[PDB]
Amino acid sequence: MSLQPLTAVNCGSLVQPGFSLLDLEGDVYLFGQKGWPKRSCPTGIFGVRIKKGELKLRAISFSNNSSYLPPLRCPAIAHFEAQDGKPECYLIHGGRTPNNELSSSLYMLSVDSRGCNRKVTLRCEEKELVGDVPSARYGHTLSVINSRGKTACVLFGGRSYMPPTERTTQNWNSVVDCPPQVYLIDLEFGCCTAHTLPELTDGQSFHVALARQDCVYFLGGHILSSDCRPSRLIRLHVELLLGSPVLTCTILHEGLTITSAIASPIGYHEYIIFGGYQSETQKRMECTYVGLDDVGVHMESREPPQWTSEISHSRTWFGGSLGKGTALVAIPSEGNPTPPEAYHFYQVSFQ
Amino acid sequence: MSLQPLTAVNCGSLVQPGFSLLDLEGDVYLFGQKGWPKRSCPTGIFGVRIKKGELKLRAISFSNNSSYLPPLRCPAIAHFEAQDGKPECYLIHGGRTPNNELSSSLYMLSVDSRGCNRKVTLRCEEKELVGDVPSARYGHTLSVINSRGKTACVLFGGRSYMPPTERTTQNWNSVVDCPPQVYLIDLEFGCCTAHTLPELTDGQSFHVALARQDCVYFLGGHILSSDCRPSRLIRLHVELLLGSPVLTCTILHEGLTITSAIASPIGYHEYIIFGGYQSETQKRMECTYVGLDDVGVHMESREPPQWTSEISHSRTWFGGSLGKGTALVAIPSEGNPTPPEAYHFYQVSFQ
Amino acid sequence: GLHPAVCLAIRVNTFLSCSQYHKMYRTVKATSGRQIFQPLHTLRNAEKELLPGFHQFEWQPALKNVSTSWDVGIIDGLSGWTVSVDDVPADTISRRFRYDVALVSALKDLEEDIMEGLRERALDDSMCTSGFTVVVKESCDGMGDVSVPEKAVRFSFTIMSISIRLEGEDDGITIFQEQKPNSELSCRPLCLMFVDESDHETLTAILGPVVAERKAMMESRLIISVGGLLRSFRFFFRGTGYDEKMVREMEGLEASGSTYICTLCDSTRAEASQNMVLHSITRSHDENLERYEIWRKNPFSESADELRDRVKGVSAKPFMETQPTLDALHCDIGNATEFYKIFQDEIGEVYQKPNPSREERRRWRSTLDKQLRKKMKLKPVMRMNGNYARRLMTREAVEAVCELVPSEERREALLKLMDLYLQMKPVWRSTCPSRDCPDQLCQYSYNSQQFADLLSSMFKYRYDGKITNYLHKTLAHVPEIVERDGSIGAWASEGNESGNKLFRRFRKMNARQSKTFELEDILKHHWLYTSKYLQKFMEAHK
Amino acid sequence: FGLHPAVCLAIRVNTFLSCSQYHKMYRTVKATSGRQIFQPLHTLRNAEKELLPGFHQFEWQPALKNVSTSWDVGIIDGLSGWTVSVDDVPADTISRRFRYDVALVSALKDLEEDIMEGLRERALDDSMCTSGFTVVVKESCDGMGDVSEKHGSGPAVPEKAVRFSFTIMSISIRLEGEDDGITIFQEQKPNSELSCRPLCLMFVDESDHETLTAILGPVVAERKAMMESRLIISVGGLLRSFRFFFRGTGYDEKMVREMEGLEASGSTYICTLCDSTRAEASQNMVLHSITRSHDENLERYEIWRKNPFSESADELRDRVKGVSAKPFMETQPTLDALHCDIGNATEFYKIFQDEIGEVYQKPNPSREERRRWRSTLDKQLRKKMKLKPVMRMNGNYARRLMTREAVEAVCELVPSEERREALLKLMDLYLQMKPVWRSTCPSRDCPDQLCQYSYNSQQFADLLSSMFKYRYDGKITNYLHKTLAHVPEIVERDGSIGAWASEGNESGNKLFRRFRKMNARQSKTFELEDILKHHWLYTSKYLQKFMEAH
DNA sequence: GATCTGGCCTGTCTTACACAGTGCTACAGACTGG
DNA sequence: CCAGTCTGTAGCACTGTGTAAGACAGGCCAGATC
DNA sequence: GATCTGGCCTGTCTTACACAGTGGTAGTACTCCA
DNA sequence: TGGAGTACTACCACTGTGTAAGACAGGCCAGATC
Ligand SMILES: [Ca+2]
Ligand SMILES: [Ca+2]
Ligand SMILES: [Ca+2]
Ligand SMILES: [Ca+2]
Ligand SMILES: [Zn+2]
Ligand SMILES: [Zn+2]
């Protein structure tokens, strides 16, 4: 439960506020970066090395039979657990293109070969979607569920630009929440089906959701309709009957007023909800710990690691989980002249 | 011969381009503080020390029988050989004060009591000059001589202000070489006399003089009349054929063509010359040596230590001699930014 | 008395503040007045017919994704960013017009001169009033060090030539061709942003609406009350007046000195060493879209560099369509810089000494500046301006420089090289080559060929496989583009760049100062400084 | 109807319009409407040469001492022919100035219109009032530090600059009977930059006495050699005489110390005019005689230097009474009406802080109680007088503090009503005696407060040393001794206090900055010349008159 | 005889403020016609 | 004689700029000491 | 312990980035007046 | 019908004399398996 001020020796210009940190097969890969993929690494994804409080960003390289990814900005990430027959995957969907545009594409990323000399090859497949496909959104959440006895994906939330008729060039960069529809996606086939929620009367965004044994928990987030942050957690239960994947939901009584959080996994189903924003200006400093049970969520507040003045005065902050009780947070720095590494970094661990 | 970059630990804002360096009874004193005597020091005569390559500056105090000297900028220094009555003494006359005028007042400075606890008390008695007094001027030179066997002093050279007839506030600050006459000063009383010879065809300025055995050698300094630097060393032999101070002069063959030269005594009658300025744009760079006896002046070009680029390239420079072969030089530390300690100091030693 | 419009012109054409103009007006009225100037409060409404949002208009059919209210004015450049902290912050302050309203204000301002063109051509004025054709040249250039620089980016356009095709049976009749697109006196601003120049994110997230209405206006037509009639208009957009780096950044090519030099042709760098003349101009916007799709989806399962090469350096979905042509001013700067390097090299020796050190080139540059100041009276400069280039391109600079070259063969060689360059230079610099100097354009192919072969023969010590990109552009694309695109130089980004000093001065004497308002009033002035109405009232018959 | 050339010169200078700017709008308005409304550039430049120095012929009888009798000289270099030899003291300091006498006759002939107007009002026969004219002159020398010219890529010391300015205060007549004075012209607001003409500009700091003396020496010699003789001017068609008196007031106390030799700054010798120390200012706070004069200070410096009594160091410094450096310019060291409150303001702030808290029962306070009293006092002022706390007492805060409102508001905390009424009476006497020095002329505006000021300050000091004896044991802030010991003697010796403040140059700082900003030639050697020419053109009474503003 | 810490004195950073201008707006006064 | 109406001038929001009062600190002597 | 290789370094090369606008001076159109 | 005096437009001096990114060549080295 402590922090450590790191330093980005070089490459301290390739991080933007919302970014992704995929943890597969040990090393962490940073995904999404400022600007199009430069030629230092044409594939946009950087292996992250944490050595002596120092931050190294090594280039990665995809397969030949893979596809190439635009560096999505704030997508939804679903850690597709090791199962037959291609472990172990990550589902990225659908994110924000560095060119200011949404993308409804679904990228299935995985590891292919290694090393021979510590080199890590990745592969990335565009997964066509059949439906009833979910329209292009961002900030949403995707999760995996294994129900009796097959694996599916639950997609929900996230904003989107105005519908393509009311979007006026003066209201272009406005954005409203996508319709409150859940989407059940099968990795194969991509027959993505949409489903309503007679209880979720409103969409939302930046809700850090979780899944446990084909039972999903949408933690509270932000709703731009009424500017409210409904702490009421959302439980739901899915049963993939043949061939209709029936769904039910329930409004949990109490949750947490959290927005744009980092979820570091501690146990098999134990997570630290690390921090984000609880108000429009106030940031949630205190940590949180959630155990996922078949009874349900078990919440407790751990000791918040002491915050330096630097991290406390800052207007904003963001980050991503390095896994195994570890994560990385950042602070927009100030000073004269440009550092130009305008982002200070704090590594954080539990226990 | 070696150079070393010193650093003014404190009291950096009390060094001006012109200053004097006196030695008597060990420690070295710095004379000619810029501005007027602050409340830090009642007098302004600082005691300077090189302690682990750092310039430490302490205050000196005066007795009651002593008069107080204005901070002359470019006086005419003269060390007095240790003998009756107060061995030794130092003759200062008269330089320019912090304001644009000349003192025209000779001062006999010496040490009176010590320590007790590593303190030094000095005395500064004015010695009135009755005559036939040498006119007010600056940059001239004074030296001690012993003529069979009485001790007197010879004064010569130095610029001055235009006489108060053509002195006009449009050229109120244009200076003129004082008429070339040698002035003879006795110390008790100050019955001064003026004399001339046709060999002194012109008056010089900043010409470093060196006396020995009542024979004085004037180097080549600089003249504003002809804008040239006469490399003609000037010998003159005098004696007090009581009660007439008979003088004779002679234009010798060669004297060095450098201006405003630092003179550090190494031996009995041996002086290393670190050199101030050879050419009116290109400063002198080498380091020469002057011996002298009844044979005459003997010049030898010693090895000049490798001037660091910072000192070697900057426009101007100045300094003094810490005695016993060592000397201090200083370069205007002009650049971004002003600390405001605007003078880098270098110690330079012989052998 | 003085017409109010003239007095507004005098105010903004000399950078006078309301305080200054008010004192001047009070004083000149109190003596021998007989009111001569007009006061502030009457000018502060006498311009409303010059800024955007005064002149009614419409489209047929209506524009997509563009509201049809025609009375809008200065709008915040964010275009309504949900300020919610949780998302990407709505940080950057900007202002702009609505492209359509800007265009209609420009046209209805040129009303006088379009009517003059109607009358001078002896064409009927009441009929043949539905098929006008406008050529609009855009330009968008960054700007640093506007005191950390803060590096604001500016976006401007210019009506280049308005022609008429009515009633048909023909191609068109050039009603009015702008006489001077080079100077900023006709280069009107449309969008100002306090965005750094290279960060794709905010640049796109603010330019998006502009590019959107640009793409939308390409289809429909415009209706304007001009010359008493409700006439119509069609537009064609030339996206030329960008520099090279920005064209690359908004094109999807990996800036800047990549293995793929040409913005228009896909010839690699090494292949641009042997061959220097024969090339084809193929890079187009739509083709770049298709190539980026072929990269992203990767339908052929190729490896990294192989796939890069199948698309020829296209790894970024471009968005702002850019006509395939080079700037004129930066071509001059690039050319000048390269001749300066070659001069620095030939004052010393290179073909005799293979690898000279750094101090040697330092001293060679020093002595070159010595020879160019002792004669020709030229001082050194850190970055090369247009004027220093024009001076470094003339003959006498060569007659002075070549004096230091020991080998007289090299002397005559670079003299003949500069001769060729002066014989071929006024091709792209001209306003209209086929009219100003047709003989150079006629003899440009053979001249370029001889020049390229002279370089490859007497300088192969240096041009083994490295070629600056403007060399390639001026040696392999000039004739094709001049043949196709009518002219060049008449489309220089100069009109923007040299105009930019306005936004510099307009921050001192016309600030507010607060970035919420600073861009607003800077834009207001910078526009009001351009309209031909005011330049007419400024010249007032010579 | 055409426009006079002088009107157009004024309307160019007075609005900082540049040459190219003026010419552009000129050709514009000329080709616009069929007339030569404004005059063009070169004729305006020729017609302006009437106002700059070096145009009117004059004479001086007896002739000046060590001053050239030429009258055609213009903008001279303040170096004064500094020999450029490298070995000597460097000669890089940029500076430009006028020849004092030429500038003076130029400003006088400018005011000639108003002096003739006053002679019309006074009905003095013009063919008779010829020789008995006398002019009072103020001269202020402040160093406007750290200017930013907005185009700096290489440091060329473009920050600090001393601006020696002078201003004609008032001109009277002397002929011919007793008639020791009739004020023919009293400038109406002698503190604003509209009338504060520059004379010398120097690109140096006000710190280094060396360069400052080196470039001011000529000006001092002119000031001296111009005190005795008479100036002959062809004014109003008559050869008339003028005699001068140079009241030099507008210096900051720092510069006054630097030019009277008094050891700076917070020395044991606070007052520049009396000799009393801090303890002698605390014992008696009212009865003091203004004694320090330029000649006496010179003699004191001689006493210090030669030490004719061989007394010890500290005893010698006490016998010379503060004079350790040779003064070099006779200055009239009046009270500075600029601050004139800020010291008094911070003293009343400390008194309130130590009166709400208990200091005259608990003699030795610590940090916490002091800061707590400050906190609660600031909260009280926020509650009642609605004044937020600040770190430094500026002007307006002092103005809003030393008022009976804030005082009767803060009275509610101090428990003993004795001390309440005591400090209220303190502030009462204070704010009653306050406009004696601030306002222009207490001899016309408020003669009652002046006539009462002696007894008023007496009661004030008695109240202080009676009920606040705990705090004025032997230490007193300088401004309090100023306001209690010399105000009546000052206003009696001169006639005012606020009418000789340094306000002129404190304002004209903005003028210098603006002229460097938009009118400079950027050559770093012409720049000063342009700044000076434009600044002088600004402040010529004639041109402000053509700015009638009707 | 020889050394060290509190008082304080003064040289240095620093930072709260006011002051500068600028466009817009709003009110206040002065001209002119019925 | 009066009201619209036009003109002049003051007020507001704003942050960039210089400034000097105050925090402080460290450095040296006095004082107490080794 | 030997290889060897992906990854970091260092150097070199290419594309931009600022440097106008202001007074003084003088040719020089060019033209008001007799 | 010509003269020169007017006004305009064209020149000159002058700040400083390096940067900030990114692609690629190539050297080479950690360090890890072989
Ligand atoms: Ca550019
Ligand atoms: Ca540019
Ligand atoms: Ca000052
Ligand atoms: Ca000041
Ligand atoms: Zn090409
Ligand atoms: Zn006093």
mmCIF file of N, CA, C and O in Angstrom, chain D residues 286-306:
data_model
loop_
_atom_site.group_PDB
_atom_site.id
_atom_site.type_symbol
_atom_site.label_atom_id
_atom_site.label_comp_id
_atom_site.label_asym_id
_atom_site.label_seq_id
_atom_site.Cartn_x
_atom_site.Cartn_y
_atom_site.Cartn_z
ATOM 1 N N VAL D 286 9.406 65.575 18.967
ATOM 2 C CA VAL D 286 8.780 66.763 18.401
ATOM 3 C C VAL D 286 9.803 67.850 18.111
ATOM 4 O O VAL D 286 9.873 68.371 16.992
ATOM 5 N N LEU D 287 10.619 68.196 19.101
ATOM 6 C CA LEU D 287 11.509 69.345 18.993
ATOM 7 C C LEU D 287 12.793 68.934 18.288
ATOM 8 O O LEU D 287 13.649 68.262 18.873
ATOM 9 N N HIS D 288 12.926 69.340 17.029
ATOM 10 C CA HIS D 288 14.136 69.110 16.257
ATOM 11 C C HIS D 288 14.312 70.260 15.282
ATOM 12 O O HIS D 288 13.333 70.798 14.760
ATOM 13 N N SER D 289 15.562 70.636 15.048
ATOM 14 C CA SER D 289 15.899 71.682 14.096
ATOM 15 C C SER D 289 16.545 71.044 12.877
ATOM 16 O O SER D 289 17.491 70.260 13.009
ATOM 17 N N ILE D 290 16.026 71.372 11.697
ATOM 18 C CA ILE D 290 16.586 70.848 10.458
ATOM 19 C C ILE D 290 17.948 71.489 10.236
ATOM 20 O O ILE D 290 18.058 72.710 10.076
ATOM 21 N N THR D 291 18.987 70.670 10.235
ATOM 22 C CA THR D 291 20.354 71.168 10.268
ATOM 23 C C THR D 291 21.194 70.745 9.075
ATOM 24 O O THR D 291 21.926 71.573 8.526
ATOM 25 N N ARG D 292 21.105 69.485 8.649
ATOM 26 C CA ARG D 292 21.988 68.983 7.602
ATOM 27 C C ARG D 292 21.844 69.801 6.328
ATOM 28 O O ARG D 292 20.742 69.956 5.794
ATOM 29 N N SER D 293 22.966 70.327 5.849
ATOM 30 C CA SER D 293 23.028 71.058 4.596
ATOM 31 C C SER D 293 24.224 70.555 3.803
ATOM 32 O O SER D 293 25.142 69.944 4.355
ATOM 33 N N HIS D 294 24.204 70.818 2.495
ATOM 34 C CA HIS D 294 25.251 70.293 1.622
ATOM 35 C C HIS D 294 26.632 70.738 2.082
ATOM 36 O O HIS D 294 27.562 69.928 2.169
ATOM 37 N N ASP D 295 26.786 72.029 2.376
ATOM 38 C CA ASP D 295 28.092 72.538 2.781
ATOM 39 C C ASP D 295 28.532 71.939 4.113
ATOM 40 O O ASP D 295 29.699 71.554 4.276
ATOM 41 N N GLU D 296 27.612 71.847 5.076
ATOM 42 C CA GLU D 296 27.962 71.253 6.360
ATOM 43 C C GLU D 296 28.323 69.784 6.202
ATOM 44 O O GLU D 296 29.234 69.291 6.872
ATOM 45 N N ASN D 297 27.635 69.072 5.308
ATOM 46 C CA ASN D 297 27.971 67.671 5.069
ATOM 47 C C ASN D 297 29.344 67.532 4.422
ATOM 48 O O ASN D 297 30.103 66.614 4.757
ATOM 49 N N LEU D 298 29.677 68.422 3.485
ATOM 50 C CA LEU D 298 31.030 68.451 2.937
ATOM 51 C C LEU D 298 32.059 68.616 4.048
ATOM 52 O O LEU D 298 33.050 67.874 4.118
ATOM 53 N N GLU D 299 31.842 69.597 4.926
ATOM 54 C CA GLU D 299 32.793 69.824 6.010
ATOM 55 C C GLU D 299 32.884 68.612 6.930
ATOM 56 O O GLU D 299 33.974 68.255 7.398
ATOM 57 N N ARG D 300 31.750 67.962 7.192
ATOM 58 C CA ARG D 300 31.763 66.754 8.010
ATOM 59 C C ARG D 300 32.582 65.653 7.351
ATOM 60 O O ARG D 300 33.334 64.942 8.025
ATOM 61 N N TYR D 301 32.445 65.490 6.033
ATOM 62 C CA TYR D 301 33.241 64.479 5.347
ATOM 63 C C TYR D 301 34.722 64.794 5.443
ATOM 64 O O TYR D 301 35.548 63.886 5.575
ATOM 65 N N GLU D 302 35.084 66.073 5.334
ATOM 66 C CA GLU D 302 36.483 66.437 5.535
ATOM 67 C C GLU D 302 36.948 66.052 6.934
ATOM 68 O O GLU D 302 38.052 65.514 7.110
ATOM 69 N N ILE D 303 36.107 66.313 7.940
ATOM 70 C CA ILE D 303 36.436 65.948 9.316
ATOM 71 C C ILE D 303 36.671 64.447 9.426
ATOM 72 O O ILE D 303 37.630 63.998 10.066
ATOM 73 N N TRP D 304 35.799 63.650 8.805
ATOM 74 C CA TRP D 304 35.955 62.199 8.850
ATOM 75 C C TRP D 304 37.241 61.769 8.165
ATOM 76 O O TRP D 304 38.015 60.974 8.712
ATOM 77 N N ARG D 305 37.477 62.275 6.954
ATOM 78 C CA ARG D 305 38.625 61.840 6.169
ATOM 79 C C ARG D 305 39.929 62.162 6.884
ATOM 80 O O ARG D 305 40.707 61.261 7.217
ATOM 81 N N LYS D 306 40.187 63.449 7.132
ATOM 82 C CA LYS D 306 41.477 63.802 7.714
ATOM 83 C C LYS D 306 41.574 63.386 9.177
ATOM 84 O O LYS D 306 42.675 63.101 9.662
#
